[PDB]
Amino acid sequence: TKVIFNGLDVNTEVQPLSDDFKQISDPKGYLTYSVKYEDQFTKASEADDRIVGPTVNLFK
């Protein structure tokens, strides 16, 4: 007794035959900005600071 089945019935799983990449989803570069602050002279909106927040807070 085989059942009527209107879809495709898969008995096997073929793995991904190769291995290369990995998925980072938030890439980070090889180079960065290092800031050295002068203590003298050193220590504005939701949608704005979500964007320019890190740039402003890094370069002040």
Partner 1 sequence: LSDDFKQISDPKGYLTYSVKYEDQFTKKDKLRASEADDRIVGPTVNLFKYGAAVVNIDLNRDFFDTATGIDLTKGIPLVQDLLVPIGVTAGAEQSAEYVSGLLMVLFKVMTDNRLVIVGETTTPMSNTLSTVVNNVLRTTYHNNVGVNPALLRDFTQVNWLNRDITNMLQQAGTKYGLGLTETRLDYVRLVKTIVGHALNIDHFAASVLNINLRALMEANVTADDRIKALQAHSMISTQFHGPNQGALRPELAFDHDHIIRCLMLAAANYPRLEGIIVQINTGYVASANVIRPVSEKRYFPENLEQNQSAARLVSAVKARASEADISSIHLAIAREVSPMFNVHELKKIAESFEDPSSIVVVLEFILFALFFPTEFNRIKGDIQNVLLLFFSRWYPVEYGIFIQRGATYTINAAGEFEFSGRNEKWDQSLYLSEHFPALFSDVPLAGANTIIAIMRLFTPQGFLRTDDLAIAANFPRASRNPQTYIPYTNQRGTVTNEFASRFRTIVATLANVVNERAVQDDMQKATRSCTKQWLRHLETQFDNIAVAHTDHLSVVYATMSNFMLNFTNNFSGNHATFKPDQYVITSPEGSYKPIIERQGETVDGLTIIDTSIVWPILCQCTYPLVEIVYPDPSTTLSQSLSVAQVLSKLTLPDAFINMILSGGDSVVMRTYQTEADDDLDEGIRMTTYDQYLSHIRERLHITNVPDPIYITGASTPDQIAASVQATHVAVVLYQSGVINGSASTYLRENEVLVVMPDYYDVVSRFANANLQMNNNRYHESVLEIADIFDQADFIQTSDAVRQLRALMPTLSTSQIRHAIERIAQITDVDSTDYGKLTLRFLGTLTRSLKMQNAQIRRIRPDGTVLRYDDQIDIEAFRWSRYFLDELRLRRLSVGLRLITNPRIARRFDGVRIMYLTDDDPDPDFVPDVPEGYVAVQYAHRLFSSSLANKRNRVTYTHPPTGMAYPSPTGRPHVHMTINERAGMSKLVADNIIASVIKSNWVVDIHDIEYTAEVMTPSEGYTQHVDAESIMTAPKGKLFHLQFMDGLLRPEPSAFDPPASGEDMRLIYPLQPISVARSMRAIVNHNEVDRPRGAVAPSSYEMDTGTLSRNGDLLYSPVANGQVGIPKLEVDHISFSNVVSMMTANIRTGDDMAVERVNPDDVRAINIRNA
Distance CA 34, CA 39 (A): 16
CA–CA distance, 20 with 33 (Å, rounded to integer): 30
Going residue by residue from 20 to 59, which x/- string records binding to partner 1, judged by CB under 8 A? Answer: xx-x---xxxxx-x----------xxxxx-xxx--xx--x
Rounded Cα–Cα distance for residues 54 and 49 (Å): 8
Positions 2 through 21 that interact with partner 1 (CB under 8 A): 2-17, 19-21
Binding residues vs partner 1 (CB under 8 A): 1-17, 19-21, 23, 27-31, 33, 44-48, 50-52, 55-56, 59
